[PDB]
Structures are given as C-alpha cells and as structure tokens.
C-alpha cells in the first residue's frame, strides 16, 4: 500500500488573517508540544510504508500530525483558532483509535494531550 | 541506563589493511547501511529512549552497524572473520530479544539475506 498524500497545508483561495490566538497556538502551544520528550511519533504524517502499517489508512480516514499543523499555522491556513484545536484533537483521537489503551504510544499521546489542554487553558481572549 | 557503546578503537593493535576488510567496508557495510530496513540497526539500541528496560539484561553482546562502521574505519579487526562475527551477533541479538515474525525480526532477516549474498562474493586474500 502507498502512503496517501499528506493533508493540505496551503490553499491560496482561502482568505487569511492573523490573530493573537493563532499566534499563541504557534508560538506557545505547538512549540511546547514539539519539544516534549514523547513528541517524535507525532512530528510528521504516519509513514505506513516505513512502519509497515497496511491497515493504518484503512482505519484512519482523517490523518493529522504536528508537522501538518505547524505548516498550516506558518501558512496562515487557519481562519479560526478552533480549526487548529480540532486538528490537535484529531491527532490525539486518531492515535487512540488505531492503537489500544495502555500501549506505550497511547501513553505518549496522552502526555502530549495533557500538556495541550494545560496550554489551551491559557489561550488568550481574542484581542 | 544504557551501557556505553561497544569499543571501536584499540591503540594496542598495529594497522593491517586487507582487500577482504576493504570489501567489508566499501561493499558490505555500505550496501547494508543503505537498505530500506537498516534504520533500526544503524546505532546501538537505546533501551532508555525505547522503553526496553530488559534489553541489556538479555543482550550482553550488543552490536550495531554504526559500531561495525567505526571498527572497520579504525582498523579494529585483524581479519574478515572478526567483522563477520559482529554482523552475525547483531542479527542473532535481534532474533533472541524479539518475538519470531515481528517486524523488526523480518527486517533483520532481510538484511541477513543480503549480508550472506555479499559474503558469498567475498574476494580471496
């Protein structure tokens, strides 16, 4: 099985804006999660070829990863902070769906999600 | 904790280079390194990072291609057979530690098949 094309990170037809919440999601939230000891599996699209996961893209219909999210933020792809938050949530829930409770990789995703939620609790009000 | 990585230099050996050792570096190590399944074998097993607290309880003779590369570069081996033994140790460790038929084992098996092809073509001394 081939890998799918990665999720879109740029679309020049979409209107663009910068907000303080989107800036916080890049400079604080993404940065903090990126540097976490357990971030490595979540830093790029799951490479089902390299990792021999013939069923991954049968099971996970909406793939998402922090590499994509990073590019989306750097590209101003997101209009709403909530789109970005949804992408993080999709990443975590995909890991929970594909894997099983108490797999090490699930514990890694849980540690990143706990940190994520702590940083989102300090999301500034839209200026 | 991980152990220190295997020794790769021994200043109390004199230099002997041979066509068989040169072949082991320039052909055997090079070709295995570039194989699509080499990546887990290119450095020592990081039991700490990988959460394998029993790895070095079970494996007392660890070996990896990064170490073999360095040994060949530092003329650590006197003969080809010492180097061949290191490759074989690397494969057997994987077979000992991991469950038969797991991905990592299948990767090792593919590398070993390639290794045995290349050693069949070892030049004469």
């Amino acid at each position: 099985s081939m890998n799918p094309p990665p999720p879109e990170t740029s679309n020049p037809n979409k209107p663009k804006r910068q907000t303080n919440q989107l800036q916080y999601l890049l400079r604080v939230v993404l940065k903090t999660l990126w540097k976490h000891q357990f971030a490595w599996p979540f830093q790029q699209p799951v490479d089902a070829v390299k990792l021999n996961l013939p069923d991954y893209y049968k099971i996970i219909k909406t793939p998402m990863d922090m590499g994509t999210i990073k590019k989306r933020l750097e590209n101003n792809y997101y209009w709403n902070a909530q789109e970005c938050i949804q992408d993080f949530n999709t990443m975590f829930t995909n890991c929970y769906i594909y894997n099983k409770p108490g797999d090490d990789i699930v514990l890694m995703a849980e540690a990143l999600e706990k940190l994520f939620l702590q940083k989102i609790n300090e999301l500034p009000t839209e200026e | 904790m991980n152990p220190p990585p295997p020794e790769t230099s021994n200043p109390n050996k004199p230099k002997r280079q041979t066509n068989q050792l040169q072949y082991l570096l320039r052909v055997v190590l090079k070709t295995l390194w570039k194989h699509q399944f080499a990546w887990p074998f290119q450095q020592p097993v990081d039991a700490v990072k990988l959460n394998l607290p029993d790895y070095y309880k079970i494996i007392k003779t660890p070996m990896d291609m990064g170490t073999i590369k360095k040994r060949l570069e530092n003329n650590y081996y006197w003969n080809a057979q010492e180097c061949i033994q290191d490759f074989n140790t690397m494969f057997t460790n994987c077979y000992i530690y991991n469950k038969p038929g797991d991905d990592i084992v299948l990767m090792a098996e593919a590398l070993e098949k390639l290794f045995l092809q290349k050693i069949n073509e070892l030049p004469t001394e």
Partner: peptide, 10 residues
C-alpha cells in the same frame, strides 16, 4: 517490554 515499530524513532 516489546518493540513496536510504530513508535521507533527514525
């Protein structure tokens, strides 16, 4: 403890 290729760094 088990090697899981999906969480193997590269």
């Amino acid at each position: 403890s088990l090697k899981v290729l999906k969480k193997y760094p590269y």
